[PDB]
Amino acid sequence: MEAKAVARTIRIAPRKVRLVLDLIRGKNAAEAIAILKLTNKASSPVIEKVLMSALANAEHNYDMNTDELVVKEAYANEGPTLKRFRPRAQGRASAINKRTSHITIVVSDGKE
Amino acid sequence: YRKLGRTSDQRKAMLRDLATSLIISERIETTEARAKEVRSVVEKLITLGKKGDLASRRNAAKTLRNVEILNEDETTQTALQKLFGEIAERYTERQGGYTRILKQGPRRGDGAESVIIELV
Amino acid sequence: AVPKRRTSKTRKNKRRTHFKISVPGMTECPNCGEYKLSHRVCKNCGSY
Amino acid sequence: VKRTYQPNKRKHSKVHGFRKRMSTKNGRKVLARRRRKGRKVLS
RNA sequence: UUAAGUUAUUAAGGGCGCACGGUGGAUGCCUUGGCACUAGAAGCCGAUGAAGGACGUUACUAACGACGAUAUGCUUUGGG
RNA sequence: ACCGAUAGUGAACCAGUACCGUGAGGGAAAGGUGAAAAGCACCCCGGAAGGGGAGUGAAAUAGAACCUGAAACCGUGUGCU
RNA sequence: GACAAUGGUAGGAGAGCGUUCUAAGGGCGUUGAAGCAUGAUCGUAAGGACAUGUGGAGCGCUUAGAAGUGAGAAUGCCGGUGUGAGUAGCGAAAGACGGGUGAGAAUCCCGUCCACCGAUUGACUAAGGUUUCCAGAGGAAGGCUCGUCCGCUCUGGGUUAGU
RNA sequence: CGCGAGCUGGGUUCAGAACGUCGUGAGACAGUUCGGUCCCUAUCCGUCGUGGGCGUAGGAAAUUUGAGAGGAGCUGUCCUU
RNA sequence: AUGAUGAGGUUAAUAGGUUCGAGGUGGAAGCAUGGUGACAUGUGGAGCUGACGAAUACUAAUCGAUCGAAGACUUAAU
């Protein structure tokens, strides 16, 4: 059985969040918490909050053993962007993309 | 020596205000490079305190800022009087050291290595 | 000054193969708490 | 550097604005043309 | 064993194929709104203060309609 | 044997309106939950957002950005390389 | 059944395929229409089917009409979306520490120290701006970072003249 | 007539002005004279350095062979004979 | 530049501190004496000294964690 959580429209950009999200996938659920507490990226308190949420949906909703779970899927999709402008020089604006992310981690124990 | 990202006078003023506050509170939280450099400042300033003569009283006041400690029972000693009176009595047998640096995690706004420098 | 050609999806992904990030220290705190960063004193949720 | 349009509440109301448009026939033409577009603010 | 000779296993990454997502609003269907007309009226008011407005008026009120201090309406005759 | 929302009036939407100009003047973009709001009581994570259940409904990847959701683009897996 | 022909640009001629609508006829659809997606199907071509998903109401076929009828190019127009690239930048400048606040503090508050302006970065007062002013409350968006703060948002207040 | 996305801009085809000359003139000369804004964050190739990956049929540590490639390579004067 | 390279990581002299130097500056402060004074002289090559040298575990190089071989066939001599 699998347990998932998502975080939709997180204001961290998708390229910046997929760095730290590559560090934790495939790894067991206990040590993935320890990686997300020690990397000093901006995304590390956000994926950790989502990994807490999917380990909680495992214990509560599906009654899994949260001690032995492994992070199967850990991906971040693109969300809707906020298109901002920026005045540079000589009356000439340039677009700034405030990108958002849908962060999704799923967790399981590998059994059916 | 390290330049700490500042001018010759901005570094000098930063480094003796950071050495005074490590006499007031005896353990302060700074960054790692600013604690590597105030380490040699305050240890050279406890060396002047273990002497205790008038000639090195004048030399410890080259460095120390004019900060007044509110001690217990509402008594007030300066940071110059607290250097030759309390720290100088603690380390009168020890031949060095006088500080330690305990590393901590990065800050939130930076990846600045936080550090507690203590007075041992 | 300007790129004469666009970079492809293949050439872009070959460039950023060293655009990675490392796993940190991760040593246990033997007194109490969770994993601390190596050679660091803990602040929260640990006894280092 | 000093730009154009240094504002003035008296001159703006006196070279534009209603009692000036109404004083000449060609300024009642600009009022009739803005009533015909449905323009919310005249003058 | 020593020679001599041959052929792998590697995928940091990439390619193709497949699968599953996300973004995005094409396409399909829909219509309050328009478009072109036909027939029948009618066309232009105002110093008795017009057209236009501005401020107001609901228990709570921003806007838009509605109506002006008798203000989110009044009277009366008929429908209902 | 007119238009179907980049069309058809600029305007199907609190349009000559946001907005632009000192001024005349210029001038947009923006329709679709379901039959019915029955619009998710409660539980869990979280500061909150968000989620995971439960529940409504014929359908909830119909959850209010809400009919279908195409490509560009972004991903995660892989079989052969 | 023989025989002959069949490279081709401007250009001429011929025969077609699809598209939307109309007419008549004949039909198909919640036992799931159109779309959409996939497939190893058929036709000489433009094309046509079928199957299976998705989809939740329309649409084929035959014959004949009508045309806003077919796009890859116009430094086309309008939308999205990349590339450059995690690159340039982050708008003159000195802060440091302690305490506090909180989900969270290099930035918020308080304190001390230091530094800067000081014929002014100090006071008034016009123009001009309109409520930004003041209290609580909040942290989506705005602030070139952060944010517990704000000229931001929410709620409630605030301007009194015979001279 | 190597080299300005390496540099200067004195020379010259810019707008000003003046002389000579020519033209009725506005102007002109290719005659002078004074003055006259030099944009670019390097994508690819190429170059100068520097890492990572893998291979080199066990894995390591250390010393080396040199297939090759590159650098160097100039010359005066004086004294003896 | 980064990373690489090198010296070290407690059985440790790696860096800092401390102690002693080297070199540098040129006679500290305080006190005494003299001068009405400004100042001189003595105390005293004095004090001070960033990167240099030596000594010293005083402080910090913690506990840990990760990666890493099992030796293919073929034929020929042996």
Swiss-Prot record, chain A:
The keyword Repressor does not apply. Keywords: Ribonucleoprotein, Ribosomal protein, RNA-binding, rRNA-binding. It comes from the Bacteria. One of its GO terms (molecular function) is structural constituent of ribosome. It holds the Pfam family Ribosomal_L22. GO terms for cellular component: cytosolic large ribosomal subunit. Coiled coil: none annotated. GO terms for biological process: translation. Belongs to the universal ribosomal protein uL22 family. NCBIfam families: rplV_bact. This protein binds specifically to 23S rRNA; its binding is stimulated by other ribosomal proteins, e.g. L4, L17, and L20. It is important during the early stages of 50S assembly. It makes multiple contacts with different domains of the 23S rRNA in the assembled 50S subunit and ribosome. Part of the 50S ribosomal subunit. This is Large ribosomal subunit protein uL22. It comes from Staphylococcus aureus (strain bovine RF122 / ET3-1). The lineage of its organism: Bacteria, Bacillati, Bacillota, Bacilli, Bacillales. The gene is rplV.
Swiss-Prot record, chain B:
Pfam families: Ribosomal_L17 (PF01196). Keywords: Ribonucleoprotein, Ribosomal protein. One of its GO terms (cellular component) is cytosolic large ribosomal subunit. Transmembrane segments: none annotated. GO terms for molecular function: structural constituent of ribosome. InterPro entries: Ribosomal_bL17, Ribosomal_bL17_CS, Ribosomal_bL17_sf. Belongs to the bacterial ribosomal protein bL17 family. Part of the 50S ribosomal subunit. Contacts protein L32. This is Large ribosomal subunit protein bL17. It comes from Staphylococcus aureus (strain bovine RF122 / ET3-1). The lineage of its organism: Bacteria, Bacillati, Bacillota, Bacilli, Bacillales.
UniProtKB/Swiss-Prot annotation, chain D:
The keyword Protein biosynthesis does not apply. Gene3D superfamilies: 1.10.287.3980. NCBIfam families: rpmH_bact. One of its GO terms (molecular function) is structural constituent of ribosome. It holds the Pfam family Ribosomal_L34. GO terms for biological process: translation. GO terms for cellular component: ribonucleoprotein complex; ribosome. Residues 1-43 are annotated as: Disordered. The gene is rpmH. This is Large ribosomal subunit protein bL34.
